[PDB]
Write a protein that binds this DNA or RNA. Structure first.
Ligand code: CL
Ligand code: CL
Ligand code: CL
Ligand code: MG
Ligand code: MG
Ligand code: RB
Ligand code: RB
Ligand code: RB
Ligand code: RB
Length: 136
RNA sequence: ACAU
DNA sequence: CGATGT
């Protein structure tokens, strides 16, 4: 109903899908960029959205912050809830890096606790998430 | 259908 | 127009 402004917003950006993948997290209230991942040569939109949420969890936990995370990705929210990224991307030499990071994000989820609410950014009502890359 |  | 996902 109402945006929770005291929150972290995350999003993926890509050049192609599958293609070059990156992600960032911003303060929802101000747009200040809080973290940005270096581009990964090949990955999918959903793998990137998943990594962005997990990185947000780790960021907030390290800073003892109870803020929720907003994501526009129904898929990535479910994958994080399940602690399992059900990606169709082939595992081969070209995709080794993205899959390493996805595997390591799952591993972190299975070995750590958090109470962070992971909320759906309601794009249809609120416009583009504040972490969007402005490429569409 | 919905979400990217 | 194409792709990734539930
Ligand atoms: Cl990552
Ligand atoms: Cl909340
Ligand atoms: Cl959701
Ligand atoms: Mg998104
Ligand atoms: Mg976006
Ligand atoms: Rb902590
Ligand atoms: Rb975009
Ligand atoms: Rb969107
Ligand atoms: Rb589809």
């Amino acid at each position: 109903e109402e945006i929770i402004w005291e929150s972290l917003s995350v999003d993926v950006g890509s050049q192609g899908n599958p293609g070059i993948v990156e992600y960032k997290g911003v303060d929802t209230k101000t747009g200040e960029v809080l973290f940005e991942r270096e581009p990964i040569p090949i990955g999918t939109n959903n793998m990137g959205e998943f990594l962005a949420i997990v990185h947000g969890l780790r960021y907030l936990k390290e800073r003892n912050s109870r803020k929720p995370i907003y994501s526009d990705s129904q898929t990535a929210i479910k994958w994080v809830k399940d602690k399992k990224a059900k990606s169709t991307l082939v595992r081969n030499e070209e995709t080794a890096l993205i899959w390493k990071l996805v595997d390591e994000a799952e591993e972190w989820l299975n070995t750590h606790t958090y109470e962070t609410p992971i909320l759906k950014w309601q794009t249809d009502k609120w416009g583009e998430i504040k972490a969007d890359y402005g490429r569409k």
